[PDB]
Structures are given as structure tokens and as C-alpha cells.
Amino acid sequence: MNIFEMLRIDEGLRLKIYKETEGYYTIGIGHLLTKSPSLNAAKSELDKAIGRNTNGVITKDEAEKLFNQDVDAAVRGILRNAKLKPVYDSLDAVRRAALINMVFQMGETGVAGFTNSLRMLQQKRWDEAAVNLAKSRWYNQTPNRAKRVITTFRTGTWDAYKNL
Structure with a gap:
């Protein structure tokens, strides 16, 4: 077991935008897109993050890429x-x-x-x-x-x- 597997367990994996427990738009392995109620605003953030016109859908590889970045960001935030x-x-x-x-x-x-x-x-x-x-x-x-x-x-x- 490691951090990636652990979080993959806690967050799950979703290829289309969804709302997490507090009702905010998310995608992938727990990648928060925005606190905003606008789905459009969410789709904008997503495209921005992905670097392409996603139409609210990403692939498995893109999700894992956001996940690696997020884990990395989390460790770094701690250390800082x-x-x-x-x-x-x-x-x-x-x-x-x-x-x-x-x-x-x-x-x-x-x-x-x-x-x-x-x-x-x-x-x-x-x-x-x-x-x-x-x-x-x-x-x-x-x-x-x-x-x-x-x-x-x-x-x-x-x-x-x-x-x-």
C-alpha cells in the first residue's frame, strides 16, 4: 500500500465531471475543479487544467496526470x-x-x-x-x-x- 493507492481508494475515479460530497464540481481522482455553482465555470477550469476542449470528459491518463500533480502539490504544501x-x-x-x-x-x-x-x-x-x-x-x-x-x-x- 502507498499514498496513491490509499487515495485512489478514498476518492475513487470518475471520468466525467461530478459533484463531491459538499456539492462542488470535481473530476478524476478527487480533483476539485471549482467551488462555483456554475457547470460552465467548471468546464472552463477543466479545459484549462487539461489544456484542451474537454467537453467535461477526460481520459484515464489525464486523470492520473492530475492526480500525480495533486499528490505532489499536497506533499509540497506540507513541507512548506x-x-x-x-x-x-x-x-x-x-x-x-x-x-x-x-x-x-x-x-x-x-x-x-x-x-x-x-x-x-x-x-x-x-x-x-x-x-x-x-x-x-x-x-x-x-x-x-x-x-x-x-x-x-x-x-x-x-x-x-x-x-x-
Whole structure:
């Protein structure tokens, strides 16, 4: 298991524009296109991202390309983040992947807001971090996903994802 497989599990893969859980237009492996309600605006962003007139449809290769860029962007955001980096640096490989998943999902900014949990993780207080992380809108809005990430932080293993 690795970050790509992990996220592929959490996000799925969709070749036509769709709305994700909060109702925003997305495509591929969780590639947010726009927060705007306009489908046109979404199609514009998509063409721009792809570099062609897509008509709202991409191929599998294009989706994987956006995915590689997004993963890359997520790691980079972490490393550049003053609150994030130190945590990331103190963690083991499995757990690093869990933090990358949250950032891919909610952005750097949103993740850096988890002050107390970040602190707990830094101190390797697994059980406590897990309970703190659950006290969030994130957990209440996408509980199955949240549970898989939280368990990964808790255990430091990929068990939450074995079977999927």
C-alpha cells in the first residue's frame, strides 16, 4: 500500500465531471475543479487544467496526470507549511501518508487548523489524537473516510485499507 493507492481508494475515479460530497464540481481522482455553482465555470477550469476542449470528459491518463500533480502539490504544501512540516517530519512512513490524505482532502490550511491533534500526533499520543480528530466536522461529514484515516494514525498500519 502507498499514498496513491490509499487515495485512489478514498476518492475513487470518475471520468466525467461530478459533484463531491459538499456539492462542488470535481473530476478524476478527487480533483476539485471549482467551488462555483456554475457547470460552465467548471468546464472552463477543466479545459484549462487539461489544456484542451474537454467537453467535461477526460481520459484515464489525464486523470492520473492530475492526480500525480495533486499528490505532489499536497506533499509540497506540507513541507512548506510551518505548522505541518514539523509534524510530518516526526512521523513514520505510514502515518505521513495519513497526513498527506487529510491535506489532499481539505487543504493545508484546513489541516493546520487541527492544532491540538497535530500536537498530539507530534507527541506520539495515538489514542488521544484519534479521539481529538473525531471531534470535527470532517469526521461527522465523511465518517467512513475519516475513520480509515484516523485508524491509520492510531495504528501506524494500513489495516483500515486492507480488503478495499
